[PDB]
């Protein structure tokens, strides 16, 4: 029941839309272990409507695709263009005018190698 | 010869005195002026 | 960025590059005169690596085509793929040439049109501020592609010294010597320029073409219309890491760097199995990657005439096995598992060897996203058998008093014949010495 309240609060953060699947919830009956099993099929459904909300607006699969194997390195044509510009600059530690140029080179290396979805690749920031 | 010695003192003092304040988006500002004088 | 200028030259080099550009539009999802499909950017993630970059979404080819014979270019403009070519980059209408059939013709014509040949081909050089290099898509057969092609291997070596040079050159045919007889002379003169004035070559034999052209293709009269089908696919196959988005050796200086042992040892053996259209009806049952590279090292798909009993004292040093399209990469390490158990490649006893495998997604097309493709770029030390074949046909011709009086009237005053003979034997001796 703890994890039930955790998933219903996630959908509540979006908006106030969920209802318990029965019109009235009773546990004051001699059967009680079949009622926590209809509690478990309830938080499974709350997972399914959260998995809904992942697949509709949020695109968790496209977010993990845009990060992970691309973060190891998947499409190096984004990065070998940026690796042309790691050999001219990255010889000494960063100065005060250097990290302004590094974000200018990441965004330059974005569109020379034709990214397919631009709001999934503007979330990249640069460590000092 | 007096004017270009003043301008040489201005361009060197403009770099260091832009690079000292208290940890806000000045790393963006310090990125831009070294890009202008060198490139 | 990674822009390469192709140097299509000669009677055979212009036709093998004509369908090379015609192959590229069918896989990019583009038309030579328009853009009717949206598959060019969502399916293909990189297009401006061989084409010129777009001004109206019209990807101009970065190509130049010079030849003494006007017959090869008059069979171009009536085809509907010539409007993609530009009539101002190379020539306008009614371009001509020599008479003409001589190696000394194009060798002497290079310094009389020296002003014009270094004017319009250099306009495409400064389009990108980081030029990749030059590929000489020329020929060895005849005197047209061999005469003028030896001149540009010298003057582009110092005017552009920091650029990659590597050619897809086709070897001539040695079946009979009736129509042409100047074949041992013009071939060895260009072969000297291919080793010291050029870094790498990609050999393409002619006697091995009709070995494949009657293997599975089932023709009775061998014509020249089949020579462009085996050649144009493996050209686009060699740039699948470069055109399509890959990660490792995605440049032309990436692939050639991992295969050349030393200068003057750069002759790479090529292999390509799938050429049959009735294989398509049985690739629906998950034909795997575990069976496609067992036949690459097996001498069946090779395009090099070599000895069959000379592979026991010769050793592979570098072998490339390129899979394309659907790979099923959970078993691509499983295919490389089975390589050490057979030892089908003889390994050099002095140093390590390498079996490099790589993959890239193919075009969004039904014959491309269904059938497995295997491109081989081998490097075996039995390639001196062709050099023993060409040299034995070279010294035998000089004792018959053939073309010693008919060849030295124009621009040849000293005997440069043994200058080609010793340098060829230097290649043949350093190959066998390379495995100590």
Swiss-Prot record, chain B:
It is found in: Cytoplasm, Cytoskeleton, Microtubule organizing center, Centrosome. Belongs to the TUBGCP family. Interacts with gamma-tubulin. Necessary for the recruitment of gamma-tubulin to the centrosome and for the formation of a functional centrosome. This is Gamma-tubulin complex component 3 homolog. It comes from Xenopus laevis (African clawed frog).
UniProtKB/Swiss-Prot annotation, chain C:
Gene3D superfamilies: Helix hairpin bin, Tubulin/FtsZ, C-terminal domain, Tubulin/FtsZ, GTPase domain. GTP binds at residues 141-147. The gene is tubg1. It comes from Xenopus laevis. It comes from the Eukaryota. This is Tubulin gamma-1 chain. One of its GO terms (molecular function) is GTP binding. CDD domains: gamma_tubulin. Keywords: Cytoplasm, Cytoskeleton, GTP-binding, Microtubule, Nucleotide-binding. Tubulin is the major constituent of microtubules. The gamma chain is found at microtubule organizing centers (MTOC) such as the spindle poles or the centrosome, suggesting that it is involved in the minus-end nucleation of microtubule assembly. GO terms for biological process: cytoplasmic microtubule organization; meiotic spindle organization; microtubule nucleation; mitotic cell cycle; mitotic sister chromatid segregation; mitotic spindle organization. GO terms for cellular component: centrosome; cytoplasm; gamma-tubulin complex; gamma-tubulin ring complex; mitotic spindle microtubule; nucleus; polar microtubule; spindle. InterPro entries: Gamma_tubulin, Tub_FtsZ_C, Tubulin, Tubulin/FtsZ-like_C, Tubulin/FtsZ_2-layer-sand-dom, Tubulin/FtsZ_GTPase_sf, Tubulin_C, Tubulin_CS. It is found in: Cytoplasm, Cytoskeleton, Microtubule organizing center, Centrosome; Cytoplasm, Cytoskeleton, Spindle. Belongs to the tubulin family.
């Amino acid at each position: 029941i703890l994890s039930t309240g955790k998933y219903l609060n996630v959908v509540r953060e979006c908006g106030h839309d969920v209802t318990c699947p029965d019109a009235k919830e009773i546990t004051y009956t001699l059967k009680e272990q079949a009622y926590v099993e209809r509690i478990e099929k309830a938080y499974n459904y709350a997972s399914k409507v959260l998995l809904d909300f992942l697949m509709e607006e949020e695109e968790l699969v496209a977010h993990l695709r845009s990060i992970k194997h691309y973060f190891l390195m998947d499409q190096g044509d984004f990065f070998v263009h940026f690796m042309d510009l790691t050999e001219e600059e990255l010889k000494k530690p960063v100065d005060d005018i250097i990290p302004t140029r590094l974000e200018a080179l990441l965004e330059l290396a974005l569109r020379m190698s034709t990214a397919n979805t631009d709001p999934f690749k503007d979330d990249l920031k640069i460590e000092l | 010869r007096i004017l270009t010695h003043f301008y040489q003192g201005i361009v060197q003092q403009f770099l260091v005195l832009l690079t000292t304040s208290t940890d806000e988006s000045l790393r963006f500002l310090s990125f831009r002026l070294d890009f202008n004088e060198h490139y | 960025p990674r822009e390469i200028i192709t140097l299509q030259l000669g009677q055979c080099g212009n036709q093998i590059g004509f369908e090379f550009w015609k192959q590229l539009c069918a896989e990019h999802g583009i038309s030579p005169e328009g853009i009717v499909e949206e598959f060019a950017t969502e399916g293909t993630d990189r297009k401006d690596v061989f084409f010129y970059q777009a001004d109206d979404e019209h990807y101009i080819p970065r190509a130049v085509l010079l030849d003494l014979e006007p017959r090869v270019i008059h069979s171009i403009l009536n085809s509907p793929y010539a409007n993609l070519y530009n009539p101002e980059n190379i020539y306008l209408s009614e371009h001509g040439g020599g008479a003409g059939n001589n190696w000394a013709s194009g060798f002497s014509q290079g310094e009389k049109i020296h002003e014009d040949i270094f004017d319009i081909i250099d306009r495409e050089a400064d389009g990108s501020d980081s030029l990749e290099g030059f590929v000489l898509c020329h020929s060895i057969a005849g005197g047209t592609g061999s005469g003028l092609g030896s001149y540009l291997l010298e003057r582009l070596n110092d005017r552009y010294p920091k650029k990659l040079v590597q050619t897809y050159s086709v070897f001539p045919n040695q079946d009979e010597m009736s129509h042409v007889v100047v074949q041992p002379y013009n071939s060895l003169l260009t072969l000297k320029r291919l080793t010291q004035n050029a870094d790498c070559v990609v050999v393409l034999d002619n006697t091995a073409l009709n070995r494949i052209a009657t293997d599975r293709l089932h023709i009775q009269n061998p014509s020249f219309s089949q020579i462009n089908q085996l050649v144009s696919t493996i050209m686009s196959a060699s740039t699948t890491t470069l055109r399509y988005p890959g990660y490792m050796n995605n440049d032309l200086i990436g692939l050639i760097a991992s295969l050349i042992p030393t200068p003057r040892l750069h002759f790479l053996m090529t292999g390509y199995t799938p050429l049959t259209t009735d294989q398509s009806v049985a690739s629906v049952r998950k034909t795997t990657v575990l069976d496609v590279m067992r036949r690459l090292l097996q001498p069946k798909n090779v395009m090099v005439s070599t000895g069959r009993d000379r592979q026991t004292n010769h050793c592979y040093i570098a072998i490339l096995n390129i899979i394309q399209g659907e790979v099923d990469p959970t078993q691509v390490h499983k295919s490389l598992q089975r390589i050490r158990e057979r030892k089908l490649a003889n390994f050099i006893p002095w140093g390590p060897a390498s079996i490099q495998v790589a993959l890239s997604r193919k075009s969004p097309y039904l014959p491309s996203a269904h059938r497995v493709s295997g491109l081989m770029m081998a490097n075996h030390t039995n390639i001196s058998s062709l050099f023993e074949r060409t040299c034995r046909q070279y010294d035998k011709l000089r004792k018959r008093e053939a073309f010693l009086e008919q060849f030295r009237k124009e621009d040849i005053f000293k005997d440069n014949f043994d200058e080609l003979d010793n340098s060829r034997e230097i290649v043949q001796q350093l190959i066998d010495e390379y495995h100590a």
